[PDB]
Swiss-Prot record:
Changing T19P: Strongly reduced interaction with RNA. The gene is PRPF8. Plays a role in pre-mRNA splicing as core component of precatalytic, catalytic and postcatalytic spliceosomal complexes, both of the predominant U2-type spliceosome and the minor U12-type spliceosome. Functions as a scaffold that mediates the ordered assembly of spliceosomal proteins and snRNAs. Required for the assembly of the U4/U6-U5 tri-snRNP complex, a building block of the spliceosome. Functions as a scaffold that positions spliceosomal U2, U5 and U6 snRNAs at splice sites on pre-mRNA substrates, so that splicing can occur. Interacts with both the 5' and the 3' splice site. Residues 1-219 are annotated as: RNase H homology domain. Widely expressed. The MPN (JAB/Mov34) domain mediates interaction with TSSC4 and SNRNP200. Has structural similarity with deubiquitinating enzymes, but lacks the residues that would bind the catalytic metal ion. Part of the U5 snRNP complex. Component of the U4/U6-U5 tri-snRNP complex composed of the U4, U6 and U5 snRNAs and at least PRPF3, PRPF4, PRPF6, PRPF8, PRPF31, SNRNP200, TXNL4A, SNRNP40, DDX23, CD2BP2, PPIH, SNU13, EFTUD2, SART1 and USP39. Component of the U5.U4atac/U6atac snRNP complexes in U12-dependent spliceosomes. Within the minor spliceosome, which acts on U12-type introns, interacts with PPIL2 and RBM48. Core component of U2-type precatalytic, catalytic and postcatalytic spliceosomal complexes. Found in a mRNA splicing-dependent exon junction complex (EJC) with SRRM1. This is Pre-mRNA-processing-splicing factor 8. Signal peptide: none annotated. It is linked to Retinitis pigmentosa 13: A retinal dystrophy belonging to the group of pigmentary retinopathies. Retinitis pigmentosa is characterized by retinal pigment deposits visible on fundus examination and primary loss of rod photoreceptor cells followed by secondary loss of cone photoreceptors. Patients typically have night vision blindness and loss of midperipheral visual field. As their condition progresses, they lose their far peripheral visual field and eventually central vision as well. It is found in: Nucleus; Nucleus speckle.
Length: 219
């Protein structure tokens, strides 16, 4: 994974989202709510969060399929906004339905390798982190927001270690949100700094939480 080339993971799982509701009359309303594309560099921790506002869906059917194409369009748009030296060499999609849309949208980038993955990388778990959930829910138009999902970790640990820690966090949040959040608050004094995503923990605290997160996923 960590060679000498820029790699992005692309997750489209959360682009088309709805809430469903049984009306007093007994019919089902399906109302789209804002979604997001997660585009993630595992070496640097850089996350490009493309917020997808509900206005993009129109007198449109099959929004689930259309969402894959909108994702591809947005990934290509991002690539075109970046200098060549910042463009990815490889794009790894978390769902196989993204392969063909991306192939078609990146024809002008013949050197980019597009591939699928069997990895469990639930960026959907970020929707359960207030910082992301609220930002997405409250958006009134599309926008892209940059985040550093590794906070200050890279000052003292490797990219490999940071990536593993992040995946454990996301997967644990995915499988049992309540228990994961307890695990990530090991002390009464535990805080998350305003510009950070994750709690400020000592090295010893991280060791224990990483084991506990892993155990939670196995359970």
């Amino acid at each position: 994974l960590f060679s000498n080339q820029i790699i992005w993971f692309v997750d489209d799982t959360n682009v088309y989202r709805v809430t469903i509701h049984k009306t007093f009359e007994g019919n089902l309303t399906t109302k789209p709510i804002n979604g997001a594309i997660f585009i993630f560099n595992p070496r640097t921790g850089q996350l490009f969060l493309k917020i997808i506002h509900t206005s993009v869906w129109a007198g449109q059917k099959r929004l689930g399929q259309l969402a894959k194409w909108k994702t591809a369009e947005e990934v290509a748009a991002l690539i075109r906004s970046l200098p060549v030296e910042e463009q990815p060499k490889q794009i790894i999609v978390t769902r196989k339905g993204m392969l063909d849309p991306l192939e078609v949208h990146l024809l002008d980038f013949p050197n980019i390798v597009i591939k699928g993955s069997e990895l469990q990388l639930p960026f959907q778990a970020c929707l359960k982190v207030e910082k992301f959930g609220d930002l997405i829910l409250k958006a009134t138009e599309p926008q892209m927001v940059l985040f550093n999902l590794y906070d200050d970790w890279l000052k003292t640990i490797s990219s490999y270690t940071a990536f593993s820690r992040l995946i454990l966090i996301l997967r644990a949040l995915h499988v049992n949100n309540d228990r994961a959040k307890v695990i990530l608050k090991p002390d009464k004094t535990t805080i998350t700094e305003p510009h950070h995503i994750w709690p400020t923990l000592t090295d010893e605290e991280w060791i224990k939480v990483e084991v506990q997160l892993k155990d939670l996923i196995l359970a």
